[PDB]
């Protein structure tokens, strides 16, 4: 029910020349509402039929105080380009993992672990109830609104946003043959399920401070040849809870369907009775001390392996072989047609 | 050439005047734009930190020096390389141009229920591919649906050289994804000659087939079993070959099966299909079918030409295998940006 604001930025707010950080497809600026002295940020996000379905989106899990707060979006011309003109809250807390990262003194609990775990669970909750599958959440997606203790972790980056079916799958049988029958098409399976393993793997995260896979692999939970107990190495995992240890196995299951769903995660007791959780220290503030480059290293794998649990509806369907032709194919057909004119004479 | 400043994937690009309409394309630093002196549609790549600890500085030279040596219809083929360090004293920044391509298979698997004629010629062009790769002595070892783009209409190209390197006896090991990845990596750890490739196009072309995956192994254990279930339990002649004490124990606890005929399982496949599977997933590696061997294969009869297959020349070491400082590296990966001759579109 938006209603996008056609009239230009500057007659309600005030533009400045201030960066607040480089996005992706262009620069986040300061901006202040002159009818309330309200300081915010500002997204280029240029008009395409992508953007309108985006904010559409990001409008509606605005009411979520765990997810960024759209405040208005207007329709005007930046720089000669058909843009619409994100306003946003301005989120100062820095990164989820920056906030470990820089830790004086206080060991990190396991408990405080589950209200984090708790606060993004709400966040994904609400965006499975409505139908909208967030894909791309991430550590640098998870931004707190200030630098205070009392800030709110909130959840952002919607550029690979998607509303889905609300269709619960009717989870495989046991008793499979032997032989592999032919897949049914059903890509929306992978909506809603690449969600929860992202929870997976930043609760991997939070626990020991590093990401499951080692390198260019992905989600296998090793510089030699290991045969056992590589799966929460007791360095650092020795005194994690079993119940823990084995909900991160359920929400990086291999297979979408099978995977655990948002409504199961928020109910299982570790996130539903968040208070009574033993309160064990963990090792994350000096892990991700020990290395900071190889931190940005792990932003970028989990991009790259996120790719691959979720699907790019914007990819073009490849055409029946007949119907193509490339450099290649006419190589080959035009060779074709040599032999019946050298059968000929 | 001049160059024009662009903020653009969290950093600022500039990049010749020449590529115009820059625009992000995902997950992927990658940008989408038109090529002004060749006409194409081509894609312009930003390698974010390149030279930031001595494994990036000497991965970026091995890397580079790479791209230069493809020359390919089927393989990914550097189009442009340029910085906008004026000189060595400002270079911090590298790019990389190449054809825009549309879509890769594992989404396509993903989204399209793929025809028996679309395997025949998706894998005749990886094969075709992996001839050329193959005849420089080198392994891709990270062939997988994700790194073989495809086109709109059909062709496709290979991608992701991150991990790859002229055939040595000894090498390092766990290299290759596990789903699409052989039995040799594990079993043995100096093996894996220029076959795993091999192996993973099987495990591709059953990927195209079905539209699931042949060995999803859950650990690096579980890969084992799903393997060894189709292939069979190895005998006691190829049970000599396993290195490791450990996993010899592993192989004679699980429960001894024989191969079973490949034409079981795939039910509606192409014979000629299944037959080439059964070539290219047999557990002795020396015994598995080449690249250059499967292109002569009746599955490929619509679209093979002998005189239209080429072969490399080979790709000698030179500096690939010392260890220097994060400058020399910068600089050697210099010397290559400067020494790139863009080929003509004839
Ligand atoms: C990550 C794939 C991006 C992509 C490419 C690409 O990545 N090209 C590319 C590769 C190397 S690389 O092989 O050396 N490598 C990965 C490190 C180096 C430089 C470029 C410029 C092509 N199409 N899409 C593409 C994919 C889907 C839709 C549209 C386009």
């Known amino acids: ?345 | 050439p001049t160059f024009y400043r662009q903020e653009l994937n969290k950093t600022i690009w500039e990049v010749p005047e020449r590529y115009q309409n820059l625009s992000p394309v995902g997950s992927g630093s990658v940008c989408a734009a038109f090529d002004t002196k060749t006409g194409l549609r081509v894609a312009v790549k930003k390698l974010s930190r390149p030279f930031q600890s001595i494994i990036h500085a000497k991965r970026t030279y091995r890397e580079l020096r790479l791209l230069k040596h493809m020359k390919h219809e089927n393989v990914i083929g550097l189009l442009d390389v340029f910085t906008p360090a004026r000189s060595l004293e400002e270079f911090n920044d590298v790019y990389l141009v190449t054809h825009l391509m549309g879509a890769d298979l594992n989404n396509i698997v993903k989204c399209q229920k793929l025809t028996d004629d679309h395997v025949q010629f998706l894998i005749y062009q990886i094969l075709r591919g992996l001839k050329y790769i193959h005849s420089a002595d080198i392994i891709h070892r990270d062939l997988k649906p994700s790194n073989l783009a495809v086109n709109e209409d059909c062709e496709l190209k290979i991608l992701d050289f991150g991990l790859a390197r002229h055939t040595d006896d000894e090498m390092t090991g766990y290299v290759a994804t596990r789903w699409y990845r052989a039995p040799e990596i594990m079993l043995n750890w100096m093996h894996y000659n220029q076959t795993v490739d091999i192996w993973s196009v099987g495990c591709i072309m059953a990927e195209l087939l079905t539209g699931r995956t042949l060995f999803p192994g859950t650990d690096h254990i579980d890969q084992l079993k799903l393997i060894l279930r189709l292939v069979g339990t190895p005998g006691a002649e190829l049970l000599k070959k396993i290195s490791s004490e450990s996993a010899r124990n592993y192989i004679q606890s699980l429960t001894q099966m024989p191969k079973m005929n490949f034409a079981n399982v795939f039910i509606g496949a192409n014979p000629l299909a299944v037959d080439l599977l059964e070539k290219m997933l047999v557990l002795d590696s020396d015994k598995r079918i080449t690249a250059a061997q499967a292109l002569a294969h009746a599955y490929f009869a619509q679209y093979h030409d002998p005189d239209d297959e080429p072969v490399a020349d080979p790709y000698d070491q030179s500096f690939e295998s010392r260890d220097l400082l994060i400058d020399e590296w910068k600089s050697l990966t210099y010397d290559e940006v400067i020494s790139f001759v863009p080929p003509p579109l004839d």
Not at chain 1, 302 to 329: F, G
């Open chain 1, 1 to 345: 029910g938006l209603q996008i604001k056609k009239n230009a930025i500057i007659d309600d707010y005030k533009v400045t020349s201030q960066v607040l950080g480089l996005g992706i497809n262009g620069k986040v600026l300061q901006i202040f509402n002159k009818r309330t002295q309200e300081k915010f940020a500002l997204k280029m996000l240029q008009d395409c039929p992508k953007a309108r379905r985006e904010v559409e989106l990001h409008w509606r899990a605005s009411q979520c105080p765990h997810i960024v707060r759209i405040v208005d979006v207007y329709e005007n011309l930046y720089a000669g380009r058909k843009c619409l003109l994100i306003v946003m809250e301005c989120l100062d807390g820095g990164e989820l993992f920056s906030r470990i990262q820089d830790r004086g003194d206080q060991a990190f609990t396991e408990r405080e672990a589950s209200e984090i775990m708790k606060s993004i669970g709400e966040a994904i909750q609400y965006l499975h109830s409505i139908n909208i599958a967030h894909r791309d959440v991430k550590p640098e997606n998870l931004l707190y609104t200030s630098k205070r203790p009392n800030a709110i972790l909130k959840l952002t980056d919607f550029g690979f946003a998607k509303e889905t079916t609300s269709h619960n799958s009717l989870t495989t049988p046991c008793y499979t043959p032997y032989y592999v029958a032919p897949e049914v098409l059903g890509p929306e399976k992978y909506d809603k399920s690449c969600d929860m393993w992202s929870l997976g793997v930043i609760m991997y995260i939070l626990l020991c401070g590093y990401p499951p896979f080692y390198s260019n692999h992905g989600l296998a939970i090793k510089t030699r040849i290991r045969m056992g107990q590589y799966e929460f190495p007791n360095p650092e995992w020795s005194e994690v809870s079993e119940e823990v240890k084995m909900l991160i196995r359920n929400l990086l299951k291999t297979e979408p369907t099978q995977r655990m769903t948002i409504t199961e995660f928020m109910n299982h007791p570790w996130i539903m009775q968040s208070t009574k959780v033993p309160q064990t220290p963990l090792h994350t503030s000096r892990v991700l001390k020990e290395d900071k480059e190889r931190w940005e290293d792990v932003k970028e794998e989990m991009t790259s392996a996120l790719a691959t649990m979720r699907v790019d509806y914007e990819q073009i369907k490849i055409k029946k072989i007949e119907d193509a032709s490339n450099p290649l194919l006419l190589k080959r057909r035009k060779k074709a047609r040599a032999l019946e004119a050298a059968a000929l004479a």
